[PDB]
Design a protein around this ligand. Sequence first.
Ligand SMILES: CC[C@H](NC(=O)c1ccc2c(ccn2S(=O)(=O)c2cccc3ccccc23)c1)c1ccccc1
Lengths: 252, 253
Amino acid sequence: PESADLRALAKHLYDSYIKSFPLTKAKARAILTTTDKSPFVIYDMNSLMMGEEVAIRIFQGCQFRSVEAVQEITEYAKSIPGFVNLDLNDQVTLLKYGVHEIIYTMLASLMNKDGVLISEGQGFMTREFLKSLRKPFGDFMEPKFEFAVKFNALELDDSDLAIFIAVIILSGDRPGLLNVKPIEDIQDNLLQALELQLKLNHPESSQLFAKLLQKMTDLRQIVTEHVQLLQVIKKTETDMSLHPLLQEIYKD
Amino acid sequence: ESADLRALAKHLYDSYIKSFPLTKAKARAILTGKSPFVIYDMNSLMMGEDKIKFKHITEVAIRIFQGCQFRSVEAVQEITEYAKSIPGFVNLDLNDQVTLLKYGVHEIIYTMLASLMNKDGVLISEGQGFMTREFLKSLRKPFGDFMEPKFEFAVKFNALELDDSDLAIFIAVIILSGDRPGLLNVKPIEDIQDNLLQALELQLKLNHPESSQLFAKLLQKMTDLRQIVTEHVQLLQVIKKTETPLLQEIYKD
Ligand SMILES: CC[C@H](NC(=O)c1ccc2c(ccn2S(=O)(=O)c2cccc3ccccc23)c1)c1ccccc1
């Protein structure tokens, strides 16, 4: 039926997602669970030193990946049908507020309860090593880990994720949007696509669609705690700097 | 099974009716016209206190806040009784029942508060009154900023045009959240909620067939509710930091 259109939309978004994100969840899980693709593990200072201030070295590295990620997400967004046709100011707005939610959603795919893949999967940084950086740097990663642990339990694959993150981008409740309605119509179509996708890809997973949507609460709260941490760093490390792209994303 | 979900929908509606005296259908009749005393300024407030029987009258802003808390306490008892009607709820671990209510009553209170609101104000005292939104945000800081976010929420929420039969099932879903901190047996909670969510989905499709993804949009509101509740405590604490005994006990939250 029009189901066909919805499948086509799912298929389109999956395709674009692979084109946009060079480290998929499927690649990630395969690394986490071979010989040619095993990661070097950083769990302390010497492992770090052999892998290549320390907490600032790590934070800066985290910044660069963050900037790279926003770049990927921007490319993916433009593939979402209708997105580029929206008012430019709104495109920018949608990007600014969607970027964190997508970054942490996808970061889950790179995480297990013990650590997180880095440097395209070549490296693996342990939760405890990150939990042991000087305050409050030692505390930026725990809520992401906790979220990922619950989120990974949903057992979503890349094809699921492609649609879900498209749904996130097209959030008409973002502050300062000029034309809510066209955004909401793209999102309605994306939601229907997502719903169908979940029903077909996880036909035993009861009300998975609802549980996925419910996980927006946790995402929201994570973003909030993160900006608070950024505000402390601002005043303590005045020698330090946020990347301009990241600056603009946190302005309001 | 599709008949069973409607059985559940109907049971929850009947219970909701027995538990919540002032329903949305009732409130909306009163807001549109078919008649309440209005509070739009300081003079009208005073006249309202000697017209409408207020049960909390024991600054001005403080008096209004205390009344809002009297009501909330009342609502907690209504929500509690309603939750007992939710199939499976009583059969849950007693500590878990207590936890679901404790973390759930606030989201539900704001949910139902929206049934009593429009862009211009809110029904009070069982619909005998109506306090204007302008008169609320005319109150001194921090008090002028406490109902505004509720109003913004309600406007958004009320646009979904839910009725009481819809809301009954939505509220039950909220109570049966398996992510409340400190639960001991999450399984039967999520189980019940799954059943409630199937019920809700079927309810909305049969009662709002023209609204394609109403289910999803309602689910998105649940996160809005958590944001509201989270933000509300951040003000509530500082209110215990402006208010300076048995009474404090009665309203310990
Ligand atoms: C968009 C927000 C952004 N980034 C994050 O909040 C964040 C944190 C850890 C991340 C990512 C993306 C990957 N990881 S990671 O756990 O794999 C990671 C943690 C620590 C150092 C890393 C260094 C390089 C690559 C990944 C790293 C984003 C941000 C904002 C301000 C400052 C720093 C970072």
